[PDB]
Amino acid sequence: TSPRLASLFACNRHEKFRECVAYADESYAESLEPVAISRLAKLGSCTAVLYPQGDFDRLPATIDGYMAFLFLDDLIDNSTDMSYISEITSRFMSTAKGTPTDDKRFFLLSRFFTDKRWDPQNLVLAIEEAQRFMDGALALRAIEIEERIITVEEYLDIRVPNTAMGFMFRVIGFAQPELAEDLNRVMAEKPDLWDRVESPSGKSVGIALDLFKVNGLHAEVCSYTNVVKIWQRESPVAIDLGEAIKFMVSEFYRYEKEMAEALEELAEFSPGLAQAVRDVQGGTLGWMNAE
């Protein structure tokens, strides 16, 4: 249920995509399979389509980082109480800042954030965005617990950093190090232009993730933190889940158009960085449309 979404942005693939898979298989089986008790190795094909003009020598590190990230976020999203989610997010941020850990769950996260090849300002950007991702996870869980009714607008604002689109855009500088300088410059000199690209990105990918969820074990629901159910409540006329899905699909396309328009203005500043952003969006949607 919920339809495939056709991104405006091509799903492009690194030429060593095969090596990316297998590195992921072999790395997972050695470093995550023991503790994880999985769709985790699949982040090989994914990194290869997120960073298709990236430097292959950075992709194995990025794969490990992203497998660890996905693993821990599954911890976070599955937690039912603020006390446990707070412990996990604080430990994530400690590790992201290079605090040593002997918790194997965090071993690959530490490898990635302490990679000596990071551009130093790029690394600071990535840590700060991971904090924003974590702050949104914490806020969304408070919402579902308190069963608080918010608007779609309020939700999407909270949700944007928690889609990790912005984090993946920051690691463009790691995976495609010829873009580190341009990444730093846009944040220092053109922050508002940057946010005009990042904000419709997070909104569209947020809507897409929420659309692709619904039901499995017995009742995920998430009635207060899934944009489809949020709109059901906010609509000024009664709408069922089906009609609600249709509307948010239309909103996906509207937010992607708004992102496209922004990327035209980013490309005059940096053609390379604009194209790398397209490919992160295009590969994310491409990879997601295995539904």
Ligand X SMILES: CC(C)=CCC/C(C)=C/CC/C(C)=C/CC/C(C)=C(\F)COP(=O)(O)OP(=O)(O)O
Binding site for Mg ion (CB under 5 A): 73, 77
Six-digit token pair at 253? 């396309």
Task: Tell me whether residue 13 or residue 190 sits nearer to ligand X (CB atom).
Answer: 13
Partner interacting with residue 46 (select from ligand X, Mg ion, none; CB below 5-8 Å by kind): ligand X
Give the nearest distance from C-beta 287 to Mg ion in angstroms: 15
User: Which ranges of 32-119 would DSSP assign to H, the alpha helix?
Assistant: 43-50, 59-77, 82-96, 107-113
Give the nearest distance from C-beta 73 to ligand X in angstroms: 4
Partner interacting with residue 66 (select from Mg ion, ligand X, none; CB below 5-8 Å by kind): ligand X
Give the nearest distance from C-beta 100 to ligand X in angstroms: 22
Query: In angstroms, what CA-CA distances link 23 with 45, 48, 66, 70, 186?
Result: 10, 11, 13, 17, 33
Six-digit token pair at 9? 């942005």
H or E element that contains 238: none
Task: Tell me whether residue 71 or residue 194 sits nearer to ligand X (CB atom).
Answer: 71
| Breaks in the chain, after residue numbers (C to N greater than 2.5 Å) | 37
CA 167 – CA 125 distance, rounded (Å): 9
CA 41 – CA 28 distance, rounded (Å): 6
Task: Tell me whether residue 212 or residue 269 sits nearer to ligand X (CB atom).
Answer: 212
Give the nearest distance from C-beta 236 to ligand X in angstroms: 27
Partner interacting with residue 205 (select from ligand X, Mg ion, none; CB below 5-8 Å by kind): ligand X
Task: Tell me whether residue 77 or residue 119 sits nearer to Mg ion (CB atom).
Answer: 77
Give the nearest distance from C-beta 74 to ligand X in angstroms: 7
Partner interacting with residue 28 (select from ligand X, Mg ion, none; CB below 5-8 Å by kind): none
Exposed e or buried b for every residue in 43-65, given b needs 16+ CB within 10 A? bbbbbbbbbbbbebebbbbbbbb
Give the nearest distance from C-beta 189 to ligand X in angstroms: 27
Q: At what angle do helices 120-146 and 152-162 cross, to 10 degrees?
A: 140
Best CA proximity match to 115, nearest among 57, 167, 187, 74 = 57
Task: Tell me whether residue 163 or residue 275 sits nearer to Mg ion (CB atom).
Answer: 163
Residues lying near ligand X in the complex (CB under 6 A) are found at 43, 46, 66, 69-70, 73, 77, 163-164, 167-168, 205, 209, 284, 287-288
Task: Tell me whether residue 114 or residue 181 sits nearer to ligand X (CB atom).
Answer: 114
Q: Which amino acid would we find at residue 223?
A: S
* Residue pair 33/77 in contact by the 8 Å Cβ criterion: no
Give the nearest distance from C-beta 237 to ligand X in angstroms: 28
Partner interacting with residue 284 (select from ligand X, Mg ion, none; CB below 5-8 Å by kind): ligand X
* Residue pair 36/71 in contact by the 8 Å Cβ criterion: yes
Partner interacting with residue 280 (select from Mg ion, ligand X, none; CB below 5-8 Å by kind): none
Partner interacting with residue 167 (select from ligand X, Mg ion, none; CB below 5-8 Å by kind): ligand X
CA 239 – CA 237 distance, rounded (Å): 6
Task: Tell me whether residue 71 or residue 118 sits nearer to Mg ion (CB atom).
Answer: 71
Give the nearest distance from C-beta 50 to ligand X in angstroms: 7
CA 288 – CA 45 distance, rounded (Å): 12
Task: Tell me whether residue 107 or residue 287 sits nearer to ligand X (CB atom).
Answer: 287
CA 73 – CA 34 distance, rounded (Å): 18
